[PDB]
């Protein structure tokens, strides 16, 4: 009578508490290491990807961003790292980070033509061009705001208002302009000590421009500071301006909510259909652990920071 170990042949090993290399026959693996390598669609809906545009560029309607105007329903946002298009003008939008964070829970948009161009009074609006953002070699400007300028040496105070009627949460953007010196201000506009005021049911604001000298960036000595707000249903909003003003033309409307993510990957686009995504590639596996990158999107498995994990069974 001879009874003993179940004989087997093996090729790999495993670690333990008291040793580092012990051979094992059923070397079961649990860690996934291989990725496809190209960006691809999620759940059959094409994600939104940009090439050189930025969030500021897209929302503010950059002249070179014209291709992206009415983007349909998407899954997630993949914006090119270190955008080149971005904002051609050397401005600065207040609290960019909170806006970017807010954009992480929206799955659809709709542009609403709230304030028609013809509705504007005698106030001149056709001289708002800039050489910093050329189009086909010609001066141009943003395609989402209107820079009102004096006409016949006049500038009546603007007292527009708006009431939100549709059951949706509108989003509004506008801006203010910092000139360079006194003569420029009195040339473009009519009077000094300009101010703007915003009125709603939740906040107030009263601002004036800053006039001083600065360095030269892109051959310009002026600045633009933008601002934004969220409007509740059945609410009202009021604007007043005695001078410098960046009036809005198009508003944004939210119609769906869900899950999204801001992304900073570097790969091109392919034709596919996956379930998860990482900044280097897609995943088509079932293991519960991976170590490609901790910043995943979707129902991806968990992330660790190691190199070898074996849950093998068997003798030896």
């Amino acid at each position: 009578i001879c009874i003993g170990y179940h004989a087997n042949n093996s090729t790999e090993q495993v670690d333990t508490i008291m040793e580092k290399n012990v051979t094992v026959t059923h070397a079961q693996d649990i860690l996934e290491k291989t990725h496809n390598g190209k960006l691809c669609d999620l759940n059959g809906v094409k994600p939104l990807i940009l090439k050189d545009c930025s969030v500021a560029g897209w929302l503010l309607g950059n002249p070179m961003c014209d291709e992206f105007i009415r983007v349909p329903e998407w899954s997630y946002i993949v914006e090119r790292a270190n955008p080149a298009n971005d904002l051609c003008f050397p401005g600065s939008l207040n609290d960019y980070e909170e806006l970017k964070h807010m954009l992480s829970r929206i799955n659809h948009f709709e542009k609403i033509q709230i304030i028609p161009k013809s509705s504007w009074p005698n106030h001149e609006t056709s001289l708002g061009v800039s050489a910093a953002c050329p189009y086909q070699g010609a001066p141009s400007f943003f395609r989402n705001v209107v820079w009102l300028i004096k006409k016949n040496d006049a500038y009546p105070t603007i007292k527009i208002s708006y009431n939100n009627t549709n059951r949706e949460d509108l989003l509004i953007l506008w801006g203010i302009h910092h000139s360079n010196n006194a003569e420029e201000q009195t040339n473009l506009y009519k009077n000094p000590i300009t101010y703007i005021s915003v009125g709603t049911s939740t906040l107030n604001q009263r601002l004036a421009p800053k006039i001083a000298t600065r360095s030269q960036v892109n051959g310009q000595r002026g600045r633009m500071d933008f601002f934004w707000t969220i409007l509740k249903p059945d609410d009202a909003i009021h604007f007043e301006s005695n001078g410098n003003f960046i009036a809005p033309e198009y508003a944004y409307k939210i119609v769906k909510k869900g899950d999204s993510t801001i992304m900073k990957s570097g790969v091109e686009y392919g034709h596919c259909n996956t379930k998860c995504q990482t900044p280097v590639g897609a995943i088509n596996s079932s293991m519960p652990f991976h170590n490609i990158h901790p910043l995943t999107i979707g129902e991806c498995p968990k992330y660790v920071k190691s190199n070898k994990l074996v849950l093998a069974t068997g003798l030896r």
Partner: antibody, heavy 120, light 107 residues
Framework: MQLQESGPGLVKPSGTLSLTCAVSGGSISNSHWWSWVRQSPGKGLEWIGEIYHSGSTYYNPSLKSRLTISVDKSKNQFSLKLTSVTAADTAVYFC????????????????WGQGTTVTV | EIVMTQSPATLSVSPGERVTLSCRASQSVGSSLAWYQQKPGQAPRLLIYAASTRATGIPARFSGSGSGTEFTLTISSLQSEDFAVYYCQQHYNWPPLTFGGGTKVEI
């Protein structure tokens, strides 16, 4: 603008159709979305797909796996290829152009060509 | 997906009088439909692209309006060249920009 359609009149079943729409007078130098529309009896008008000048493409989900658009900057010629003709219903095809940014960029097909048919 | 359907099929009208067309959708769309009219042997031309604008077509002769899931065109006058086939489409979401059914108005 003079939008012209160059078709071969392909018939051979289990073949690969290829119609090449070329733009005259104008050129591919502005923001637009060229499109294909096919008209067939019994179901009217179907939208085939669109493609921007930078390389972005949108296809019909019905024939996405079998249809492909290509473009040529050299002489501004954009073409369609469908790899199987057994599903073709001898519909009449047209290549058309939408509106520019001055109109708000709505997805409507403004300008249309002469149109040409094909049979299997 | 969004599916389009119009109930009436054939209308028989006299010149100069008032006619209505109906366009009945399947889901909330907003203001994102368009209308097309086809002449025999010719490509269509644009008449209504936004739900409440008339930048394309012939002014002061046609009109269309609606919301929710129901839309309607009125003319209040028509000439000998207005008899054609009319189509209703949506453009609220991509890719499947499906087209509506056909209807024929004639003497």
């Amino acid at each position: 603008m003079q939008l012209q359609e160059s078709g071969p009149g392909l018939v051979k079943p289990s073949g690969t159709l290829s119609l090449t729409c070329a733009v005259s007078g104008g050129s591919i130098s502005n923001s637009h979305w060229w499109s294909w529309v096919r008209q067939s009896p019994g179901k009217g008008l179907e939208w085939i797909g669109e493609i921007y000048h930078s390389g972005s493409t949108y296809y019909n989900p019905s024939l996405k796996s079998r249809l492909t658009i290509s473009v040529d900057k050299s002489k501004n010629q954009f073409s369609l290829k469908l790899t199987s003709v057994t599903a073709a219903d001898t519909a009449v095809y047209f290549c058309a152009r939408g509106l520019g940014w001055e109109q708000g960029g709505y997805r409507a097909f403004d300008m249309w060509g002469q149109g040409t048919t094909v049979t299997v | 997906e969004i599916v389009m359907t119009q109930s009436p099929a054939t209308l028989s009208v006299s010149p100069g009088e008032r006619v209505t067309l109906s366009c009945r959708a399947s889901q909330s769309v907003g203001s994102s439909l368009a209308w097309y009219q086809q002449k025999p042997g010719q490509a269509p031309r644009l008449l209504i692209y936004a739900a409440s604008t008339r930048a394309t077509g012939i002014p002061a002769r046609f009109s269309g309006s609606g919301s929710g899931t129901e839309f309607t065109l009125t003319i209040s006058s028509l000439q000998s060249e207005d008899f054609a086939v009319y189509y209703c489409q949506q453009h609220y979401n991509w890719p499947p920009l499906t087209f509506g059914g056909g209807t024929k108005v004639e003497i």
